[PDB]
Design a protein around this ligand. Sequence first.
Ligand SMILES: CC(=O)N[C@@H]1[C@@H](O[C@@H]2OC(C(=O)O)=C[C@H](O)[C@H]2O)[C@@H](OS(=O)(=O)O)[C@@H](COS(=O)(=O)O)O[C@H]1O
Ligand SMILES: CC(=O)N[C@@H]1[C@@H](O[C@@H]2OC(C(=O)O)=C[C@H](O)[C@H]2O)[C@@H](OS(=O)(=O)O)[C@@H](COS(=O)(=O)O)O[C@H]1O
Ligand SMILES: [Mg+2]
Length: 966
Amino acid sequence: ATSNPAFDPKNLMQSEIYHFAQNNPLADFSSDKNSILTLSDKRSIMGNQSLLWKWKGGSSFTLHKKLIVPTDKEASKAWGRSSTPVFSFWLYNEKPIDGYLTIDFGEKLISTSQAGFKVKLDFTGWRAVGVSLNNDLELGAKVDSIRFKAPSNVSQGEIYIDRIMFSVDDARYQWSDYQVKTRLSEPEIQFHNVKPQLPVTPENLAAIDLIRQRLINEFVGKETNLALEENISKLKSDFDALNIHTLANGGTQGRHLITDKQIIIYQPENLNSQDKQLFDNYVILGNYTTLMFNISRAYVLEKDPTQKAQLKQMYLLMTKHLLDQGFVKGSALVTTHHWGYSSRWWYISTLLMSDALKEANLQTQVYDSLLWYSREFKSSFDMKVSADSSDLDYFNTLSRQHLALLLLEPDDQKRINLVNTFSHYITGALTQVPPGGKDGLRPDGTAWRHEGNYPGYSFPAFKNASQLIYLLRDTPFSVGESGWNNLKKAMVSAWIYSNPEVGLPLAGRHPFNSPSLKSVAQGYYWLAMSAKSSPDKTLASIYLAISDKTQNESTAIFGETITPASLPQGFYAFNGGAFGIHRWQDKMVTLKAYNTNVWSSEIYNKDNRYGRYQSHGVAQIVSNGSQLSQGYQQEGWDWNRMQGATTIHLPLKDLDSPKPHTLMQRGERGFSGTSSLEGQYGMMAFDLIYPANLERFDPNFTAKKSVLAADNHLIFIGSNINSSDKNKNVETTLFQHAITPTLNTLWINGQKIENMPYQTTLQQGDWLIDSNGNGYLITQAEKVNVSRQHQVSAENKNRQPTEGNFSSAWIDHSTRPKDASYEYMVFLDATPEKMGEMAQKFRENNGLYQVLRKDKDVHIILDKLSNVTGYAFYQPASIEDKWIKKVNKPAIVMTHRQKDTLIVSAVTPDLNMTRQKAATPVTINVTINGKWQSSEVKYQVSGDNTELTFTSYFGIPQEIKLSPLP
Ligand SMILES: CC(=O)N[C@@H]1[C@@H](O[C@@H]2OC(C(=O)O)=C[C@H](O)[C@H]2O)[C@@H](OS(=O)(=O)O)[C@@H](COS(=O)(=O)O)O[C@H]1O
Ligand SMILES: CC(=O)N[C@@H]1[C@@H](O[C@@H]2OC(C(=O)O)=C[C@H](O)[C@H]2O)[C@@H](OS(=O)(=O)O)[C@@H](COS(=O)(=O)O)O[C@H]1O
Ligand SMILES: [Mg+2]
């Protein structure tokens, strides 16, 4: 504390704190005859002493401090967000008081003399009080008096006060509690309860105790963001450093506990050097509760009985210090927002210490406290299934904590009702199709957070949701088969679209830091072993592949011999992210588009700044293994040249998102994505349309981009490519990868190229092989550039410069000022000898494929290697074709004529929804030439032709096998 006024307009953000760690510490305080002020070193919040106030009822003391109270607007301007000036302090009662402490603000006040507030004194332990001086008093600039009046209707009494503070605080975070009413309240949990109730029986109680034990087992024998410490020397050393001691008639003294978010009320950047030094002595709750958990785990594993007892005493003392510090029911502590980050491992520690807390008579206090602070999560913790219940962050950061809270309930019947209700909650959250863009699983196996398919959030949710189902398995509390089935679909999908990292197009805002299925591995074991007919051989076979375990290892793990899954082969459509996956041998190709319902990219203030082209009709090829080891290197990466994309090559200042904070650019129409045929063949249809008026986006940049994928190959075609500037800098990237000693060779037309730097220009009938063994045959292009070159780029978080050496090739569309086009073919198993053979078949009147149509209405690709035809109806149309005559909606149709049958698939990749509305099915009428008889696809012969009726739900393809009528 200084001689300056509070909120000194001179230095508004500098908190004025009465902590008494300074010379003449009571200088600014006066008392009436019926009050006595002493320092005590018995307990304190900041510095080693607190104000002991002995009083008779109605007696006052006065703090004399000039307050220049800012408006909410002036506070907000000073800090840069919605702010209010706050008055706060800590008080300790050694015994409860039945009445109210009155705090009054005014000028030159005395016992007998503007505005003020009340604090109920019915409690023991530390409590914090924090009120907005502008919004929470029942204030003219001349305030110099803060009068603390003991309650009238109570004969005498005593109170410890510390850390009386004037600060600028976040306007969201002065919360009401059992001591103070503010303008803000986080209402208490009100648990839902499902009927019928399960009875208290030995069988149901035993199942509850086995669920608790199974949780203990998971935490005592590696969690992300759990700073595990197993060295007991280290736990004892950290614990002693808390300087906790039990006091005579109750409570503790030890270092003050504060959450990472509670520190805001101090404005610590702006603290005077004296206050900062004391503040720096606080303990961050996150660290403290992590320590409680590590001690609990060590306790559970400890074989030495002396050490074991010591670890229990350490845990219970930490528990007593935490409760006495005011982390108790009815104590807001001004705020506890983002409570999970500070407390998640406290919840889990209570499972391990449940019997110790029972014996110490602390279980009801710890349960009431955790329940109270959990009210921040009321939307999930109440356990009433809603459109928001499928929250993927919940499944990651809160679901096991939620279970642990319920198991901590002291009454047996209520504990069984809560865990029964939880099982129903989790089942519904894992079963329902949330409307619109809300979080959760989807029927194609995509899994959404931030209103789209998001592996970076779904992968940790899959791990923990699988664990939850496994914890409850084979009990009266087991998750419904419908939730198991949905989660299996999403997790088998993740195995398909990862190799073992998700591709660049699925990286969300973390390009070059893709999530890996390796982090989810244990979830496959958990979900396999929780099957109704356990083990689920598909999920077990994936667990062994991903975890690098052999068939010989399977018997001990699963109780029967299972062969590790081979990599999935064929084509899989995922219109939930307007993508598809083509798999052949050890390669995965991620084909990705975007549309009204699928954002192109997530770009934040410091994430994915150059990610504009993440979903521009990309076709990233990934062999099984590290993507970095295959040359997907962020340093020097040209963000313009995403593999398969058609882009405008821009300087990075122009490619950067035009929004300083968040942009999630959605497309201009519902239709773009993929479809599949026989689980083997795929097609992408991408209508590249830019916004009419977004800064840095050329409103006239357009392209129609189709890909047909079958076996070892993909046919890429593009048409109707345009820009505002005659296709200047408009380019289609064949590939880009870093040059390393392992990635040193390109082939061009049978010649080995290793020089750096190197440039050449190729054209129709030329071919290349990149260092990852992908071959590219140029089948239509005037100008293909190939470059081995030093590149300068910038990293996606802070735009700081990077550099690296890269091999790349791209089509230059500037040679066709209007409606530029391309065709090329990729071989996934290319060798110079096989590419010589494919080039020869291309020169033989194109024995590889034929484009039957390539315009703004339809792209039709006949693959002559596979004998499959792909039809990208960008618009409804009548066509001239052997098989297809007409389609009445934008759609993707595919055909395969085999021996005695014609197989037809159809879909729209349009999800037919908004951010708000549920997807509904689209009816697609596909007329085919000839008379056919036979899948849920309906057909009707109609003259010399056959009407097929497809139902496209969430872009999930349907197919039918037809055979000719005579
Ligand atoms: C603040 C911001 O830039 N984005 C908001 C999200 O926050 C980020 O995402 C998450 C997360 O999803 O866990 C945590 C961090 O705050 C940020 O990286 C997020 O807000 S959240 O309440 O913090 O989670 C979302 C809201 O959820 S959502 O649309 O799935 O409903 O809003 C983002 O904009
Ligand atoms: C999409 C996203 O940001 N997800 C969050 C995680 O970050 C990804 O994973 C990790 C990582 O934790 O190694 C690092 C990068 O930030 C992302 O690639 C991660 O956020 S965190 O900022 O890394 O802590 C997790 C945190 O989960 S936790 O709450 O289990 O610790 O939240 C993600 O899902
Ligand atoms: Mg003090």
